[PDB]
Amino acid sequence: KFPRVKNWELGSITYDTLCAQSQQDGPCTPRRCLGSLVLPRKLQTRPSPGPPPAEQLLSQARDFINQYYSSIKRSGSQAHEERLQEVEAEVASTGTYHLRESELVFGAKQAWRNAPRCVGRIQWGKLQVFDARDCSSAQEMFTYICNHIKYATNRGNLRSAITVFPQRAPGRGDFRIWNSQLVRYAGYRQQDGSVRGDPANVEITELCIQHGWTPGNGRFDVLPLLLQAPDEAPELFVLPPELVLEVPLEHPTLEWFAALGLRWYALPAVSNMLLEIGGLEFSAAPFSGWYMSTEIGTRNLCDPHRYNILEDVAVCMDLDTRTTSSLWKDKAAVEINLAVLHSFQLAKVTIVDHHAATVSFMKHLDNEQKARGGCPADWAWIVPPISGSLTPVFHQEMVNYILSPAFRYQPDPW
Amino acid sequence: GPKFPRVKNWELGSITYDTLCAQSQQDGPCTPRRCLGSLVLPRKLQTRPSPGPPPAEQLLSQARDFINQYYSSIKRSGSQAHEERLQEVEAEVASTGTYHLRESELVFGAKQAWRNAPRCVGRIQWGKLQVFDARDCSSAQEMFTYICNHIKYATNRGNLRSAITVFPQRAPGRGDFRIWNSQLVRYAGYRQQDGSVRGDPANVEITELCIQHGWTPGNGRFDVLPLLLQAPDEAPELFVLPPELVLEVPLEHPTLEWFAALGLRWYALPAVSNMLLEIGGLEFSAAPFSGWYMSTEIGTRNLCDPHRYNILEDVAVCMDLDTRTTSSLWKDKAAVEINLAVLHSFQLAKVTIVDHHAATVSFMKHLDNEQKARGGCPADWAWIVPPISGSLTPVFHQEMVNYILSPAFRYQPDPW
Ligand code: HEM
Ligand code: HEM
Ligand SMILES: NC(=[NH2+])NCCC[C@H](N)C(=O)O
Ligand SMILES: [Zn+2]
């Protein structure tokens, strides 16, 4: 039942007993493994036409309350039995319930802790939870968002944070942030099927224009936010330029690199995922930490369907782009990642390279083994996009499963 | 839409459905509660030895299934030849408890097992495989002759050719034919006084077994090991491969002149010899197969893995890189030059090799072919994506479905 897990570099063995707490199903079955799929309908939390029946919600709620009081060690006290009483009374009457701020804070950190695809989980206990459940309009969402950004950025000394908007109610639409991240660069479809800017943001850029935005035409034009209040059309809000910290990219030894005009924002904040805590679903709960250099240098700038600067940089380096055996792609990629680390360090902006990051994740796997008897990790996401075997996580076997609280994917509001 | 797995390629935006997984008859390690897909040796990819022949019904359903696959491949499903062969197989199993494959059936199944291998990125070559029938072999001495012929044919002086030699199958009430070494060519790993290892740390146990069986050891980082071949019910016999038979490549760098001075090298022929070949229920415990290397296997895994040659720091020091801080990306830089050196050395020596970019681009082409041909292709993402420059190759952005299909190459316990 309990999977035997091995590290092939050290030859050490551990038994994951935590996977037994998993109550939510993954995309896999004995017939076939679907662990490499990014978006399975299993990790997704779609709509619904009728509220979740009390039986199920009550069991998820009681479990979470059990998790919480067990964290503060008062597992069994009167406060515990009374909090359970309260949840049950509210669900029985209203078919739903509400969390306390302390409970919401414990649940958010635990959602991050439980996130299989996150390599930065060693920082899980250090999270600023902004309570925004007392928000009634898109305009208010914007103010809250601006406070999250100014706090998290911190003049370059980034701090992990999350802002939790009102949960979903059966009798209405959701509070949603249409953008996938608080900071994104525009992607303009240019006549000849070409794309100016970030190809990943083409659709969102169009929606912003459809909703009245005056677009530019640069490669790094920060998009405005489309915030949506329940059952209302999204409203456009332009982020103040002073709130959006950006780092211009230059290379430590290649003077011509800076001339490329490359740059990237400091704050990585996902805003399209759903935070589930004790049966309660929060459709708008943006979270942010700090970047791992590979996200910018490798993926964002080198992916074929993104900025794809690999060839341009190779040419500037005068590499042999004729054949692949010259490893021109590899060499160029290394220098770009190097330029990213040098630039963020020069500008005094928090950044972590993939070696430091994965080394800290291995320590985290160790902490969780003693703490909980295991740790859910998605190998393909934990192992960096370049130099995979040069890092310790590559030689570590991992078990993947769903634990709750959890950050899950959800449908696009449009 | 369709009831089968929906698979997406994020680079192109294309979608495909895997219907081939519906033909899987062997369970994997995963369940809806958790994914155990990253485990190298899960007990689900291994086939434990047998102290008793396979139950005549499980073996029959498996045998029947294989014969149907064979007849469908030649387009004679339902024919008289098909029905007669099925009757002939259950007639054999009926009185002997087992059965035997026809020459062409063995050639078909061997090519099919490679075709069905989820961890192999070189499957676009699956149709081109030299199948050496060695089911008449009766001694460890003959096993050596057969292997020497395999090595000579496959090596072909640098212009490598994929090949497999099939020795007699598992027979109940009789010992197995086994090659003790993991690969036909392996470098020795000597356990030092100080706990360290000289040579290949992966080969420490086999090196000690060879010594225990009469081999006089050397003291170099690149000493080719002798073969420990075992015929049924006999102790394993030691055989030394003639040096002229083992083609090796001295490593040098195209621009870094000092690299040649490192004394690094690697053999040309990659030949797995400890895997079991399973065809229609029949088990071939000794069936060594070979192809040609992908540059990353040597330059990245073999030479740079912490538990292998671990030369990353040495080369970085030669390149005068800051090995005190991670952010200098000294590991990434050194690893790149080490892979370039492997590619340069093999191309120079006129020995066959393929870089990770070309290999993965050809595997994508294989995926398209298999989509039209069988409606899918079982692929283990972690093993398909190269150990360096992952998202720089096309396969990284391709979602894959993994499952077990037979014929297959499976893991087996060590004979010792
Ligand atoms: C502290 C710094 C952090 C670093 C260095 C870090 C790094 C990463 C990386 C490299 C990924 C993969 C991204 C991709 O490939 O698209 C990731 C994913 C993720 N991170 Fe972290 N993380 C950090 C903080 C956080 C925080 C603050 C939260 C939540 C409160 C969080 C939640 C997640 C989740 C849920 C995912 C999965 C996202 C998805 O599936 O798209 N991370 N993180
Ligand atoms: C022709 C060139 C070929 C190339 C470039 C190729 C490449 C590879 C690579 C890179 C691996 C991963 C090895 C590792 O990470 O340890 C692999 C695994 C494998 N290949 Fe191929 N292969 C080729 C030929 C063959 C042949 C001829 C067969 C069999 C007839 C075959 C069967 C397999 C199997 C079963 C594995 C998985 C081994 C395991 O699970 O440990 N391959 N191949
Ligand atoms: N963002 C990531 N780290 N993705 C890892 C690989 C996931 C997926 N198999 C793909 O096509 O990319
Ligand atoms: Zn799986």
Short mmCIF file of N, CA, C and O in Angstrom, two decimals, chain B residues 57-138:
data_model
loop_
_atom_site.label_atom_id
_atom_site.label_comp_id
_atom_site.label_asym_id
_atom_site.label_seq_id
_atom_site.Cartn_x
_atom_site.Cartn_y
_atom_site.Cartn_z
N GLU B 57 -3.14 -21.73 -18.26
CA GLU B 57 -4.26 -20.90 -18.76
C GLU B 57 -3.82 -19.46 -18.95
O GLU B 57 -4.24 -18.80 -19.90
N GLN B 58 -3.02 -18.96 -18.02
CA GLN B 58 -2.50 -17.60 -18.11
C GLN B 58 -1.52 -17.54 -19.28
O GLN B 58 -1.51 -16.58 -20.05
N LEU B 59 -0.76 -18.62 -19.44
CA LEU B 59 0.21 -18.74 -20.52
C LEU B 59 -0.50 -18.86 -21.87
O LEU B 59 -0.03 -18.33 -22.87
N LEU B 60 -1.63 -19.56 -21.87
CA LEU B 60 -2.40 -19.75 -23.09
C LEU B 60 -3.02 -18.44 -23.56
O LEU B 60 -2.89 -18.08 -24.72
N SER B 61 -3.68 -17.71 -22.66
CA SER B 61 -4.31 -16.45 -23.07
C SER B 61 -3.25 -15.50 -23.63
O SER B 61 -3.49 -14.81 -24.62
N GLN B 62 -2.06 -15.51 -23.01
CA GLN B 62 -0.96 -14.67 -23.45
C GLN B 62 -0.44 -15.11 -24.81
O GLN B 62 -0.22 -14.29 -25.70
N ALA B 63 -0.27 -16.42 -24.97
CA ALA B 63 0.21 -17.00 -26.22
C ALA B 63 -0.79 -16.75 -27.36
O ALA B 63 -0.40 -16.37 -28.46
N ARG B 64 -2.07 -16.92 -27.06
CA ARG B 64 -3.14 -16.72 -28.04
C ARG B 64 -3.13 -15.27 -28.51
O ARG B 64 -3.23 -14.99 -29.71
N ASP B 65 -2.95 -14.36 -27.56
CA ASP B 65 -2.93 -12.93 -27.84
C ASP B 65 -1.77 -12.54 -28.74
O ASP B 65 -1.93 -11.72 -29.64
N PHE B 66 -0.60 -13.10 -28.47
CA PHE B 66 0.58 -12.82 -29.28
C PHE B 66 0.40 -13.31 -30.73
O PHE B 66 0.73 -12.61 -31.68
N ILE B 67 -0.13 -14.52 -30.88
CA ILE B 67 -0.35 -15.11 -32.19
C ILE B 67 -1.33 -14.26 -33.01
O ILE B 67 -1.15 -14.09 -34.23
N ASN B 68 -2.32 -13.68 -32.33
CA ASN B 68 -3.31 -12.81 -32.98
C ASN B 68 -2.61 -11.53 -33.45
O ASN B 68 -2.92 -11.00 -34.51
N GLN B 69 -1.66 -11.04 -32.65
CA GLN B 69 -0.91 -9.84 -33.01
C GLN B 69 -0.08 -10.15 -34.24
O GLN B 69 -0.03 -9.35 -35.18
N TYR B 70 0.57 -11.31 -34.23
CA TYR B 70 1.41 -11.73 -35.34
C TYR B 70 0.59 -11.84 -36.62
O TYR B 70 0.95 -11.27 -37.65
N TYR B 71 -0.52 -12.57 -36.56
CA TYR B 71 -1.36 -12.72 -37.74
C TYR B 71 -2.00 -11.43 -38.24
O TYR B 71 -2.22 -11.26 -39.45
N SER B 72 -2.24 -10.48 -37.35
CA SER B 72 -2.82 -9.21 -37.76
C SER B 72 -1.76 -8.39 -38.49
O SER B 72 -2.07 -7.68 -39.44
N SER B 73 -0.50 -8.53 -38.07
CA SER B 73 0.60 -7.79 -38.70
C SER B 73 0.87 -8.27 -40.13
O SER B 73 1.40 -7.51 -40.95
N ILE B 74 0.55 -9.53 -40.42
CA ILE B 74 0.75 -10.06 -41.76
C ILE B 74 -0.56 -10.06 -42.54
O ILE B 74 -0.63 -10.54 -43.68
N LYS B 75 -1.61 -9.54 -41.90
CA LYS B 75 -2.95 -9.41 -42.48
C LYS B 75 -3.68 -10.73 -42.78
O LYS B 75 -4.35 -10.83 -43.80
N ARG B 76 -3.55 -11.72 -41.89
CA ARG B 76 -4.20 -13.02 -42.06
C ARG B 76 -5.00 -13.39 -40.81
O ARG B 76 -5.02 -14.55 -40.40
N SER B 77 -5.65 -12.40 -40.20
CA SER B 77 -6.44 -12.65 -39.00
C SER B 77 -7.74 -13.38 -39.33
O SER B 77 -8.52 -12.95 -40.17
N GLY B 78 -7.96 -14.51 -38.65
CA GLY B 78 -9.16 -15.29 -38.88
C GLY B 78 -8.96 -16.38 -39.92
O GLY B 78 -9.82 -17.26 -40.05
N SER B 79 -7.83 -16.35 -40.63
CA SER B 79 -7.51 -17.32 -41.67
C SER B 79 -7.31 -18.74 -41.14
O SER B 79 -7.32 -18.97 -39.93
N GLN B 80 -7.09 -19.68 -42.05
CA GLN B 80 -6.88 -21.08 -41.69
C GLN B 80 -5.51 -21.25 -41.03
O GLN B 80 -5.36 -22.04 -40.10
N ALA B 81 -4.53 -20.48 -41.51
CA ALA B 81 -3.17 -20.51 -40.97
C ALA B 81 -3.19 -19.99 -39.55
O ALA B 81 -2.47 -20.49 -38.68
N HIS B 82 -4.02 -18.98 -39.32
CA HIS B 82 -4.15 -18.38 -38.00
C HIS B 82 -4.77 -19.37 -37.02
O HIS B 82 -4.23 -19.60 -35.94
N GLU B 83 -5.88 -19.98 -37.42
CA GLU B 83 -6.59 -20.94 -36.58
C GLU B 83 -5.80 -22.21 -36.32
O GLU B 83 -5.91 -22.81 -35.24
N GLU B 84 -5.02 -22.64 -37.30
CA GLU B 84 -4.21 -23.84 -37.16
C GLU B 84 -3.09 -23.58 -36.19
O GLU B 84 -2.79 -24.42 -35.34
N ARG B 85 -2.49 -22.40 -36.28
CA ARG B 85 -1.39 -22.04 -35.40
C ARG B 85 -1.85 -21.96 -33.94
O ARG B 85 -1.15 -22.42 -33.05
N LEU B 86 -3.04 -21.40 -33.72
CA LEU B 86 -3.57 -21.29 -32.36
C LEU B 86 -3.77 -22.69 -31.77
O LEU B 86 -3.40 -22.94 -30.62
N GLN B 87 -4.32 -23.60 -32.58
CA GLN B 87 -4.57 -24.99 -32.18
C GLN B 87 -3.25 -25.69 -31.87
O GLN B 87 -3.18 -26.52 -30.96
N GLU B 88 -2.25 -25.39 -32.69
CA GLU B 88 -0.91 -25.95 -32.56
C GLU B 88 -0.23 -25.47 -31.27
O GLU B 88 0.52 -26.23 -30.65
N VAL B 89 -0.49 -24.22 -30.88
CA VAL B 89 0.10 -23.67 -29.66
C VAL B 89 -0.54 -24.30 -28.42
O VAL B 89 0.18 -24.67 -27.49
N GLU B 90 -1.87 -24.40 -28.39
CA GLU B 90 -2.55 -25.00 -27.24
C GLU B 90 -2.40 -26.51 -27.19
O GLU B 90 -2.72 -27.14 -26.18
N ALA B 91 -1.89 -27.08 -28.28
CA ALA B 91 -1.62 -28.51 -28.37
C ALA B 91 -0.24 -28.71 -27.73
O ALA B 91 -0.02 -29.68 -27.01
N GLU B 92 0.67 -27.77 -28.00
CA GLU B 92 2.02 -27.81 -27.44
C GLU B 92 1.92 -27.60 -25.93
O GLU B 92 2.48 -28.38 -25.16
N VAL B 93 1.23 -26.54 -25.52
CA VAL B 93 1.06 -26.25 -24.10
C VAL B 93 0.33 -27.40 -23.42
O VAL B 93 0.67 -27.77 -22.29
N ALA B 94 -0.61 -28.01 -24.15
CA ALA B 94 -1.40 -29.12 -23.64
C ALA B 94 -0.56 -30.29 -23.12
O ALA B 94 -0.80 -30.80 -22.03
N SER B 95 0.45 -30.69 -23.89
CA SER B 95 1.30 -31.82 -23.51
C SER B 95 2.66 -31.47 -22.89
O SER B 95 3.18 -32.25 -22.08
N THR B 96 3.23 -30.32 -23.25
CA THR B 96 4.53 -29.92 -22.71
C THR B 96 4.47 -28.84 -21.64
O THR B 96 5.44 -28.65 -20.90
N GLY B 97 3.36 -28.11 -21.57
CA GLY B 97 3.22 -27.05 -20.58
C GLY B 97 3.71 -25.71 -21.09
O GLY B 97 3.47 -24.67 -20.47
N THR B 98 4.36 -25.72 -22.25
CA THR B 98 4.90 -24.52 -22.88
C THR B 98 4.73 -24.70 -24.39
O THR B 98 4.08 -25.64 -24.84
N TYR B 99 5.28 -23.77 -25.17
CA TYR B 99 5.23 -23.84 -26.62
C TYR B 99 6.49 -23.16 -27.17
O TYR B 99 7.36 -22.75 -26.40
N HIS B 100 6.62 -23.11 -28.50
CA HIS B 100 7.78 -22.49 -29.15
C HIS B 100 7.39 -21.63 -30.35
O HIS B 100 6.49 -21.98 -31.12
N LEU B 101 8.10 -20.51 -30.53
CA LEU B 101 7.82 -19.57 -31.61
C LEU B 101 8.47 -19.99 -32.92
O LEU B 101 9.48 -20.68 -32.92
N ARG B 102 7.87 -19.57 -34.04
CA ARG B 102 8.44 -19.85 -35.35
C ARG B 102 9.45 -18.73 -35.54
O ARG B 102 9.36 -17.69 -34.87
N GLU B 103 10.41 -18.94 -36.43
CA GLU B 103 11.44 -17.95 -36.69
C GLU B 103 10.88 -16.53 -36.87
O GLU B 103 11.26 -15.62 -36.14
N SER B 104 9.96 -16.36 -37.81
CA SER B 104 9.37 -15.05 -38.09
C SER B 104 8.60 -14.43 -36.91
O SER B 104 8.55 -13.21 -36.76
N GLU B 105 8.01 -15.28 -36.08
CA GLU B 105 7.28 -14.81 -34.91
C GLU B 105 8.24 -14.19 -33.91
O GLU B 105 7.90 -13.21 -33.24
N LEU B 106 9.44 -14.76 -33.80
CA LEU B 106 10.45 -14.24 -32.90
C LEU B 106 10.95 -12.89 -33.42
O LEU B 106 11.11 -11.95 -32.64
N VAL B 107 11.18 -12.79 -34.73
CA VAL B 107 11.63 -11.54 -35.33
C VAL B 107 10.58 -10.45 -35.10
O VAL B 107 10.93 -9.31 -34.80
N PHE B 108 9.31 -10.81 -35.26
CA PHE B 108 8.20 -9.88 -35.06
C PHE B 108 8.11 -9.38 -33.61
O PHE B 108 8.07 -8.18 -33.35
N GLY B 109 8.07 -10.32 -32.67
CA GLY B 109 7.97 -9.98 -31.27
C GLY B 109 9.13 -9.17 -30.73
O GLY B 109 8.92 -8.30 -29.89
N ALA B 110 10.34 -9.46 -31.19
CA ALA B 110 11.51 -8.74 -30.73
C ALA B 110 11.41 -7.27 -31.15
O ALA B 110 11.63 -6.36 -30.34
N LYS B 111 11.04 -7.04 -32.41
CA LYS B 111 10.87 -5.69 -32.94
C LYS B 111 9.71 -4.98 -32.24
O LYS B 111 9.71 -3.75 -32.08
N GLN B 112 8.71 -5.76 -31.84
CA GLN B 112 7.54 -5.23 -31.18
C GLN B 112 7.85 -4.82 -29.74
O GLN B 112 7.33 -3.81 -29.26
N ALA B 113 8.70 -5.58 -29.05
CA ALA B 113 9.09 -5.25 -27.68
C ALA B 113 9.84 -3.91 -27.65
O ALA B 113 9.65 -3.12 -26.73
N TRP B 114 10.70 -3.68 -28.63
CA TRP B 114 11.44 -2.43 -28.71
C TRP B 114 10.44 -1.32 -29.02
O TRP B 114 10.46 -0.26 -28.40
N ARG B 115 9.55 -1.60 -29.97
CA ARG B 115 8.52 -0.65 -30.36
C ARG B 115 7.65 -0.27 -29.15
O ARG B 115 7.22 0.87 -29.02
N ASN B 116 7.43 -1.24 -28.26
CA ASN B 116 6.61 -1.04 -27.07
C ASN B 116 7.34 -0.45 -25.86
O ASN B 116 6.69 -0.16 -24.85
N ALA B 117 8.66 -0.27 -25.94
CA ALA B 117 9.45 0.28 -24.83
C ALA B 117 9.20 1.78 -24.57
O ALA B 117 9.69 2.62 -25.30
N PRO B 118 8.47 2.14 -23.49
CA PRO B 118 8.15 3.53 -23.12
C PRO B 118 9.33 4.45 -22.79
O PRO B 118 9.23 5.67 -22.96
N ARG B 119 10.42 3.86 -22.32
CA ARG B 119 11.61 4.62 -21.93
C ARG B 119 12.64 4.85 -23.02
O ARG B 119 13.65 5.54 -22.80
N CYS B 120 12.37 4.34 -24.22
CA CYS B 120 13.30 4.50 -25.31
C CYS B 120 12.92 5.66 -26.24
O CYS B 120 11.82 5.70 -26.78
N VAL B 121 13.85 6.59 -26.42
CA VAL B 121 13.62 7.73 -27.28
C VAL B 121 14.03 7.43 -28.73
O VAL B 121 13.69 8.18 -29.65
N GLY B 122 14.74 6.32 -28.94
CA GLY B 122 15.20 5.97 -30.28
C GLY B 122 14.32 5.04 -31.08
O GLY B 122 14.76 4.48 -32.08
N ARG B 123 13.06 4.91 -30.66
CA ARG B 123 12.11 4.02 -31.32
C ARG B 123 11.72 4.29 -32.77
O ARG B 123 11.01 3.49 -33.36
N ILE B 124 12.19 5.39 -33.37
CA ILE B 124 11.85 5.65 -34.77
C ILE B 124 12.56 4.62 -35.66
O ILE B 124 12.20 4.42 -36.82
N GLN B 125 13.57 3.96 -35.08
CA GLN B 125 14.38 2.95 -35.75
C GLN B 125 13.86 1.54 -35.51
O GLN B 125 14.44 0.58 -36.02
N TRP B 126 12.77 1.40 -34.74
CA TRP B 126 12.22 0.08 -34.38
C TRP B 126 12.08 -0.96 -35.49
O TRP B 126 12.27 -2.16 -35.25
N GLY B 127 11.76 -0.51 -36.70
CA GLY B 127 11.61 -1.43 -37.81
C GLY B 127 12.93 -2.02 -38.28
O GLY B 127 12.94 -3.10 -38.88
N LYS B 128 14.03 -1.32 -38.03
CA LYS B 128 15.36 -1.77 -38.43
C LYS B 128 16.13 -2.39 -37.25
O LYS B 128 16.84 -1.69 -36.51
N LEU B 129 15.98 -3.70 -37.08
CA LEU B 129 16.64 -4.44 -35.99
C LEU B 129 17.07 -5.83 -36.46
O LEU B 129 16.26 -6.61 -36.97
N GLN B 130 18.36 -6.13 -36.29
CA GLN B 130 18.88 -7.43 -36.68
C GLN B 130 18.63 -8.40 -35.54
O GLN B 130 19.15 -8.24 -34.45
N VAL B 131 17.77 -9.39 -35.80
CA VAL B 131 17.42 -10.38 -34.80
C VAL B 131 18.21 -11.68 -35.00
O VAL B 131 17.96 -12.44 -35.94
N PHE B 132 19.21 -11.89 -34.15
CA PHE B 132 20.04 -13.09 -34.20
C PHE B 132 19.41 -14.17 -33.35
O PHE B 132 19.30 -14.02 -32.13
N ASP B 133 18.96 -15.23 -34.01
CA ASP B 133 18.34 -16.35 -33.31
C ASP B 133 19.46 -17.20 -32.70
O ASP B 133 20.36 -17.66 -33.41
N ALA B 134 19.42 -17.38 -31.39
CA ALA B 134 20.43 -18.17 -30.70
C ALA B 134 19.77 -19.18 -29.79
O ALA B 134 20.36 -19.59 -28.79
N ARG B 135 18.57 -19.61 -30.17
CA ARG B 135 17.81 -20.58 -29.38
C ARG B 135 18.33 -22.01 -29.44
O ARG B 135 17.69 -22.93 -28.91
N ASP B 136 19.47 -22.19 -30.09
CA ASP B 136 20.12 -23.50 -30.21
C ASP B 136 21.36 -23.57 -29.31
O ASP B 136 22.03 -24.60 -29.24
N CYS B 137 21.69 -22.44 -28.69
CA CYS B 137 22.84 -22.32 -27.81
C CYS B 137 22.68 -23.27 -26.63
O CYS B 137 21.63 -23.32 -26.01
N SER B 138 23.74 -24.01 -26.31
CA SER B 138 23.66 -24.97 -25.21
C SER B 138 24.75 -24.86 -24.15
O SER B 138 24.73 -25.58 -23.15
#
